[PDB]
Amino acid sequence: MKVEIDSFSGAKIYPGRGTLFVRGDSKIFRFQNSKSASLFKQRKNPRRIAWTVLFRKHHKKGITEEVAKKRSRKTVKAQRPITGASLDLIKERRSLKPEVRKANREEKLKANKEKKKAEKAARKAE
Amino acid sequence: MKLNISYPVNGSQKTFEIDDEHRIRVFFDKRIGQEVDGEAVGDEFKGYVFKISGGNDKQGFPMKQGVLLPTRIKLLLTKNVSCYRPRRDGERKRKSVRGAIVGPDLAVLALVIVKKGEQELEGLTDTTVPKRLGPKRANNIRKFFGLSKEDDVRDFVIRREVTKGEKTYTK
RNA sequence: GAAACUGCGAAUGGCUCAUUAAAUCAGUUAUCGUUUAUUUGAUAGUUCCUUUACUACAUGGUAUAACUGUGGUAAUUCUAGA
RNA sequence: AUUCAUAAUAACUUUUCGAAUCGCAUGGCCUUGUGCUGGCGAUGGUUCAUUCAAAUUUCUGCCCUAUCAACUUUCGAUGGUAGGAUAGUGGCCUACCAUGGUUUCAACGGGUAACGGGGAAUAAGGGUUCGAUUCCGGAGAGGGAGCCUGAGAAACGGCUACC
RNA sequence: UGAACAGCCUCUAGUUGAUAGAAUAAUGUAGAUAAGGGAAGUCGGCAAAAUAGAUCCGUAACUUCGGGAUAAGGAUUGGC
RNA sequence: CAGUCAAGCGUUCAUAGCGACAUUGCUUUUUGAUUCUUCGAUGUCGGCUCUUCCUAUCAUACCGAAGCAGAAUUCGGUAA
RNA sequence: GAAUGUUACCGCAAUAGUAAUUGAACUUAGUACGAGAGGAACAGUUCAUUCGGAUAAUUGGUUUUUGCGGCUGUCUGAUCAGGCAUUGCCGCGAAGCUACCAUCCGCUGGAUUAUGGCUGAACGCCUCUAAGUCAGAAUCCAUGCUAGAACGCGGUGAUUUC
RNA sequence: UGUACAACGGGGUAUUGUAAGCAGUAGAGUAGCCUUGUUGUUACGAUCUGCUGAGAUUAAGCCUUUGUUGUCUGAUUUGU
Known part of the structure; x- marks a missing residue:
């Protein structure tokens, strides 16, 4: 079985309890x-009705749902190789980068x- | 039901045909981005914790984010959005989807792992798919390795060997 | 060099004459009242903004597709998930 | 013929443009540095003009009907002022104001086996009739409405809805 | 209040009289409401309901040209 | 309303089913006939409502017969 | 409701009453049967019609809860809070009552008719019949259900003191 | 004279729809103030917002109470 939500009040409708309408x-x-049924037939707005969940949530009452969005204080933590570079030798050449006399002599x-x-x-030309 | 679970660091993925109807009643009435307990669904998943990423219900209509209901809806979707690819520039389109609440209507639920529990999983954690591609841009390679501004990405390049016949080459 | 991203074009052509009797249309004027991709001819010394360390300019950052694979519908040029 | 072109003062801008693009060829100075300079191109790019367009617009001109003589203006009809919108003028729209405007020199209404024209048959002349129909301009995509993308559509071999 | 010596409330003046007390079965009398349908009821829409004031709009046939006509039919109405 | 008889109909055959001409009965739901009671009053048609009864059974239960292949139908019995 | 010796409790059960009714659909089966055309049936299942007896979880109705709120006019100096308006009016409205407008339930055994038959003579055969005998219906009677004879009965308990 | 009863109170459950009172740099605005603000201040002013799913009612034929306060020998009749 399942439980459902009044269009108007937004309330759990345990099985059998309550009416249904098909426009x-x-x-x-x-x-x-x-x-709720009679108000609906009166074409009322639940956002204006006070005891309703829509008014409740539109006036921000009972706001214990949301808290915050979390944030991680670190990096991806992967200075990995690119699958064709041999990360050991990659870091070795990265360390050979300082003392750049090699590239300077090539230049x-x-x-x-x-x-x-x-x-x-x-x-x-001459 | 089915759980299309993924481990994104290992890049692994597997479907799990789930029963224990109440240990998926726990999954019922759940949104996207929320994280529930591997042990609660299954002691085979004891200690693990997932994140409900989404899923397809029957009739293949996916779960879309932000709508906040379990029932299906017809949205006049547009580009830059899930669950619709435009076959023309400018084309908005009405398509049917299911929303961001979990219930029996679902058939496959897509999950991602954020923490690895105590035990090990056969097709996710014991395995790890490699990175299919290497970074094709100079500075991306350079920072990926942590070399310098000048450490010759040209020679730090990726070389992926493949044989056409017996002639082999890295292309 | 498929596929895919991108840029163009898809507003032309072609079909019919339902509409429409100062309306279209035809000749005849104007834009000193306006848009105009594209072509074609010309055209950006002046962009460090407490402008001194605030900043690589032998040059900077970001995905994301295609693809890998998990896949879900009876069906869709259906689409999510990693 | 201009408050035109155009120039300068003073500021405004959430900030517009001022090449991080690409193929070939590789050329010259030595201060012997991967120093400095260099060509033929493609792409795109602010403004102006041009060209293919586009939209509005002046005068003239349309078939039969009075067994249709008053028509228009409530809630735009005519004008004016201010403003909004438009890419742009302007009742295009609004606020306010004057109450006007067309009419037997046939308004307005109805009908049309009416899209219009360039033209066709037919003739001494005059003419009558036809002309959807190969070219030109319009309209439409089953009827209607709306709109995104775009320089350009109210697109329909594109979307949204209703019928 | 409101068109109103209507209806409703009040002031002055006048009354508080009509056997009373307890419970609240039927059947009645008087008053009312009722889902869905809508006169299928019945001799017959009897009874009851619905409409209703005011402003604005619009208004047929027929006509003794005076009317029909509040025709029909629709919209609006508070408070500050 | 139901019987007796059976010329005939029914392709042929009176009787599956009908059954003219003739005839014996039943009922009192008609309409007459009569005038016993009732004219110092038995409230007078129908409908509505509501019960009960008879069966000469329309349907339903079980059966028999057929010019009943099946379906459909007809006749008949216990049965109200 | 007097009276049965009193009073209380548990029971019996004479007699009377009685109720459950019909159809559809699927299946059997496009089978049987039929040249073909067409076209069945019993059992089984799910449903409904009519009638009945209860019940009010749900839904609906009802609303003097005059419970909450609001509305008009007027009176209480104004407010707050209230009166009157033949229950002033509206919306909601529990409880209770109530609805084929809602829901639930509505039994199985015997003897029998008609009819078909068994053996079987009279009538040395034959015959359902005459003696005997089988199955057989919405029938009949019981099961069951309703009341319980107020002059029908039983079992049991306690039965008054200064 | 007690897992006694009753009237109040409390709690729960339900109904309704957010009480009065206060405050507001809320409020169509209109008048007056001046040191003419930048919330300027003042008088009035429906209504809005916060305290407030608040307040009220809740067995009278709802449930439950470690609470409080009380009540608990009046009459008549009866014999195998």
């Missing part, structure tokens, strides 16, 4: 009680290479 547009309403080599490049290019 021509196929909207199925349920009513715990003829009180100096390609630098004298650019020197000789302009030189030999001018030579061929």
